[PDB]
Amino acid sequence: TAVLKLYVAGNTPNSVRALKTLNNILEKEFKGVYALKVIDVLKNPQLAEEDKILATPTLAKVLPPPVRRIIGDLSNREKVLIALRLLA
Amino acid sequence: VKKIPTMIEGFDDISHGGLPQGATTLVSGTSGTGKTLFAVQFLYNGITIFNEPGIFVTFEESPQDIIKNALSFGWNLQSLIDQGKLFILDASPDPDGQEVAGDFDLSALIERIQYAIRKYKATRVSIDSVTAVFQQYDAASVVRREIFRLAFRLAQLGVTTIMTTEEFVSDNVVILRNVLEGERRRRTVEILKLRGTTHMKGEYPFTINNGINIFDY
Numbered sequence A: 001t002a003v004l005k006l007y008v009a010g011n012t013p014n015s016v017r018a019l020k021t022l023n024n025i026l027e028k029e030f031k032g033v034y035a036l037k038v039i040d041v042l043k044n045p046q047l048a049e050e051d052k053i054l055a056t057p058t059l060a061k062v063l064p065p066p067v068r069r070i071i072g073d074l075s076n077r078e079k080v081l082i083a084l085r086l087l088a
Numbered sequence B: 001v002k003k004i005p006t007m008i009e010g011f012d013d014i015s016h017g018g019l020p021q022g023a024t025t026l027v028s029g030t031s032g033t034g035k036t037l038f039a040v041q042f043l044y045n046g047i048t049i050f051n052e053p054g055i056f057v058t059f060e061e062s063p064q065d066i067i068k069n070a071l072s073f074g075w076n077l078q079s080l081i082d083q084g085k086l087f088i089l090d091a092s093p094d095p096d097g098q099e100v101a102g103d104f105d106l107s108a109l110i111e112r113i114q115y116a117i118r119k120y121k122a123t124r125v126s127i128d129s130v131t132a133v134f135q136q137y138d139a140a141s142v143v144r145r146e147i148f149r150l151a152f153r154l155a156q157l158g159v160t161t162i163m164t165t166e167e168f169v170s171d172n173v174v175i176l177r178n179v180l181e182g183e184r185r186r187r188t189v190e191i192l193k194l195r196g197t198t199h200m201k202g203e204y205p206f207t208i209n210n211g212i213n214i215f216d217y
């Protein structure tokens, strides 16, 4: 029931890649674990301001605290898999 | 080439009118030379004298230190934040560091700055410091490209910008220096280049008292 926020810039290629990759992971190797909320910083920059986001894409585990962050298009799958295990 | 007055004592005189409007000026200098003071005073003077809102983008200092440090100069930045005329945009590093898992850029940062400019109707921006951004990321290539993209966007929005430096390429560059002379401090400012326009050449002395006070020109 923990919450992930993915901060993307629209349909730019790093963000398209990151979202495809992450949906694949969360439907397979992490099937039950996280809730995913996607935040488009091109549409809602004010939310990037609130959450203090600089890099795009940014994956953040936001609930339960503490908040922990990974940046990048997640094309390094094993680093992402390892990172999500540790936040779970 | 139109210029925006700084009202920093002496500066509009040695720069012949102030800073080139709608462009980035680089303020370069080692630690302790007054770069942050120049950046803050540009926005403060902007708001209090011309009613031009400012955005201070900080990549290193906490906004709480920027506020508390401006006090000794008689500048109440919290009042101008409460009034909606100044916004400090906190892009300082997160204490847990940056964990990389693929390619990225700094789109969110550039969209935040753009949003802030529109929300606050800002026409002056200070960024402090370009150097700190590079230190934040083991990806100099990403940062260098994003600073250009940012400068490009700021200029298309029409704002006038100071970027401080201790990388970036500019045709507007101001150098701050602080030399130890025996046991006294000799501070100088030099306008190195100003975008195909006219300015006084060489180092001029300044002092810090209620701002930067340039003299002997």
Ligand SMILES: Nc1ncnc2c1ncn2[C@@H]1O[C@H](COP(=O)(O)OP(=O)(O)O)[C@@H](O)[C@H]1O
Pocket: B029, B030, B031, B032, B033, B034, B035, B036, B037, B069, B072, B128, B129, B208
């Ligand atoms: N109370 C004060 N009186 C006189 N000068 C001050 C005072 N507080 C700060 N300053 C000057 O403002 C300078 C800002 O310098 P600089 O290092 O170039 O920017 P930054 O703070 O971003 O590193 C300080 O280094 C200091 O010399």
